[PDB]
Design a protein around this ligand. Structure first.
Ligand SMILES: Nc1ccn([C@H]2C[C@H](O)[C@@H](COP(=O)(O)OP(=O)(O)OP(=O)(O)O)O2)c(=O)n1
Ligand SMILES: OC[C@H]1O[C@@](CO)(O[C@H]2O[C@H](CO)[C@@H](O)[C@H](O)[C@H]2O)[C@@H](O)[C@@H]1O
Ligand SMILES: OC[C@H]1O[C@@](CO)(O[C@H]2O[C@H](CO)[C@@H](O)[C@H](O)[C@H]2O)[C@@H](O)[C@@H]1O
Ligand SMILES: [Mg+2]
Length: 580
DNA sequence: GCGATCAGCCC
DNA sequence: CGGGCTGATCGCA
């Protein structure tokens, strides 16, 4: 049965009620400077569809959109807010976002459209976006009659589903998480995305030139050593050269052929000079294709800025993800790739990049939740946690900790957070399961509180069916009861890791909210640009650095109060690279 | 074209 | 052993 609604040619007062479900449709996946194809409004007075050129040109409608006292319920309000920012229109008063609501209730559902969210409550009087717009090359906006009914049905679903979703969030003790954390954060992310990050394209282009030269040299050297030319970028062709023509040992295989991952190649290096060249080629090629070419493809020609989109409702742990471009995985470990960061610069003259990061937030969170006396004491003394772990598991004094011991203790600490496993640790340290198991046992002997926590959290996940974070984020783990060892073990590691990674996500998200409030109160021009899981990157006038050096770490350190202190390091400079 | 496979970058 | 995104190649269409 078709849904009734008014296909309006003009905006009326009835459409501007102080409470409504609103749909500002942006079909393009990347909504930056994207078209708004239609608008739907559902309120106490009825259901309405408005053509964008009409509504967005109407003073009354624009004013309604920007009035904080006029409450709107939406799905993915950030998408609408940003698309409107590019049009110079402010969206305020969004009191409920169905996308974020669904995400908090169950991240695993992968809710990506109104239909998916509605199906959670047995509401199916709305079609999936893909069914309406199609996919890939076939994607397209349908004729007005079809478009209008779809947007109205989506607004109608939001209107009907708000109460049921809020009720369940309240039962889950997650309503404040939505209203005081995720929704306010959505607006902050919208500002960050819209501001974008300035890129020194000339810098990138020059790097690309030099890489091309280096790649040419290495490429030829490879063919020389192989005695023939082939596609190095083809694990298939490369495998034949290495394991068949050159007869190198097959230390590991892939489900479809020979493994050629860096991990394996490093072990084969002693056998043939071609290996190091392949590794070098892989390194340069990664920088060239993914970072130089990749970044240049998404930089806006007119402003020379890149505008990422932070997916706030995707990860199973509460973290954000970044796309087109992903600015959360810019090289830093290796000097060559690290130089790419010199291309990320302040958007204004005489401004600088300021970066602040939490020091070991995950292990500090673990110390807090596990209430491990030894681990808490370690952080209260602000000790080098890896050196400390080495001293405990290897039974030696600080002065007796060798570089290799610290390196292995560090790997153990990662495993503990990820959800320890002899097999996983062994592969990482290139040792045996028996040996790796010995490290684990020694770790738990030194940190019995952590052992108790790991045991207890797994039991809790099985009993309740899910685990939670400091701010009540939730993750269901149905596989925790599986009779399949591999499937069950993965779920157990998730039970151990989610509260840690998840709570760290909760903390930095609150820090971002607290920070923006402080920056506004202080009337600073500084503003957030990026978040990279445990770090915040801002840009600001050089005259604001001294104030930021005190303000940013304090706000981040005081976001939440744990049984151990939170510690934040910071750096600033002329480019992201120099913010070290 | 579309998508599984393999690779490698980040925290 | 935890959580992500993107680019290359290549079978399949
Ligand atoms: N109705 C609620 C209550 C709590 N929370 C989330 C966000 C809060 O910041 C966090 C802590 O809530 P409280 O301070 O009330 O702590 P509880 O009393 O919930 O203790 P516990 O966190 O151990 O459940 O949990 C929420 O989203 N909705
Ligand atoms: O707007 C982001 C928001 O939309 C979803 C779908 O509801 O993702 C879409 O937009 C992303 C940004 O361009 C794309 O990466 C993704 O492929 C597209 O479906 C949500 O997942 C997200 O929270
Ligand atoms: O002492 C058992 C020990 O094994 C773990 C897995 O390492 O859990 C197993 O035993 C539990 C019963 O005590 C089951 O609930 C669980 O499903 C099974 O895998 C640890 O959690 C536990 O400490
Ligand atoms: Mg750090």
């Amino acid at each position: 049965k078709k849904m009734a609604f008014t296909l309006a040619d003009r905006v009326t007062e009835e459409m501007l009620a102080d409470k409504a479900a609103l749909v500002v449709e942006v079909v393009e996946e990347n909504y930056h400077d994207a078209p708004i194809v239609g608008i739907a409004v559902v309120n106490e007075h009825g259901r309405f569809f408005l053509r964008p050129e009409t509504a967005l040109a109407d003073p009354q409608f624009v004013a309604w959109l920007g009035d904080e006292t006029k409450k709107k319920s939406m799905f993915d309000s950030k998408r609408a807010a940003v698309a409107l920012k590019w049009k110079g229109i402010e969206l305020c008063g969004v009191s409920f976002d169905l996308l974020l609501a669904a995400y908090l209730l169950d991240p695993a559902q992968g809710v990506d459209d109104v239909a998916a969210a509605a199906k959670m409550k047995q509401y199916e009087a709305v079609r999936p976006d893909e069914a309406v717009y199609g996919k890939g090359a076939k994607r397209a906006v349908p004729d007005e009659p079809v478009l209008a009914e779809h947007l109205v049905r989506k607004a109608a679903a939001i209107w009907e589903l708000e109460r049921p979703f809020l009720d369940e969030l309240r039962r889950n003790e997650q309503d404040r998480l939505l209203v005081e954390l995720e929704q306010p954060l959505s607006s902050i992310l919208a500002e960050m995305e819209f501001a974008g990050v300035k890129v020194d394209t000339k810098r990138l282009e020059q790097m690309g030139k030099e890489l091309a030269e280096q790649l040419g040299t290495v490429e030829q050297r490879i063919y020389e050593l192989a005695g023939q030319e082939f596609n190095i970028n083809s694990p298939k062709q490369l495998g034949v050269i290495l394991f068949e023509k050159l007869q190198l040992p097959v230390l590991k295989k892939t489900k479809t052929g020979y493994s050629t991952s860096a991990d394996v190649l490093e072990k084969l290096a002693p056998y043939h000079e071609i290996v190091e060249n392949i590794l070098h080629y892989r390194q340069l090629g990664k920088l060239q294709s993914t970072y130089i070419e990749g970044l240049l493809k998404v930089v806006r020609p007119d402003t020379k800025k890149v505008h990422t989109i932070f997916n706030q409702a995707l990860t199973q742990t509460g973290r954000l993800s970044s796309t087109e471009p992903n600015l959360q995985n810019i090289p830093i470990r290796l000097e060559e790739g690290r130089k790419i960061r010199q291309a990320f610069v302040p958007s204004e003259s005489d401004w600088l990049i300021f970066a602040a990061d939490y020091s070991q937030i995950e292990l500090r969170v673990l110390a807090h939740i596990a209430e491990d006396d030894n681990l808490m004491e370690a952080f209260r003394r602000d000790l080098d946690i890896h050196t400390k772990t080495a001293m405990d598991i290897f039974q030696v004094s600080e002065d007796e900790v060798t570089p290799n011991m610290r390196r292995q203790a560090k790997a153990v600490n990662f495993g503990i957070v990820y959800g320890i496993s002899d097999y996983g640790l062994a592969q990482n340290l290139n040792i045996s399961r028996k040996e790796a198991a010995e490290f684990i046992e020694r770790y738990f002997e030194s940190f019995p509180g952590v052992k108790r926590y790991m045991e207890n959290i797994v039991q809790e996940a099985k009993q309740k069916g899910y685990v939670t974070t400091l701010l009540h984020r939730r993750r269901y783990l149905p596989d925790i009861t599986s009779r399949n060892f591999n499937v069950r073990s993965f779920a157990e590691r998730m039970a151990m890791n989610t509260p840690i990674q998840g709570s760290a996500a909760d903390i930095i998200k609150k820090a971002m909210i607290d920070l923006n409030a402080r920056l506004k109160e202080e009337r600073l021009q500084a503003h957030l640009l990026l978040q990279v899981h445990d770090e915040l990157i801002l840009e600001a006038p050089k005259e604001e650095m001294e104030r930021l050096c005190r303000l940013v770490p304090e706000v981040m350190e005081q976001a939440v109060t744990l049984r151990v202190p939170l510690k934040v390091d910071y750096h600033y400079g002329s480019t992201w690279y120099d913010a070290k």
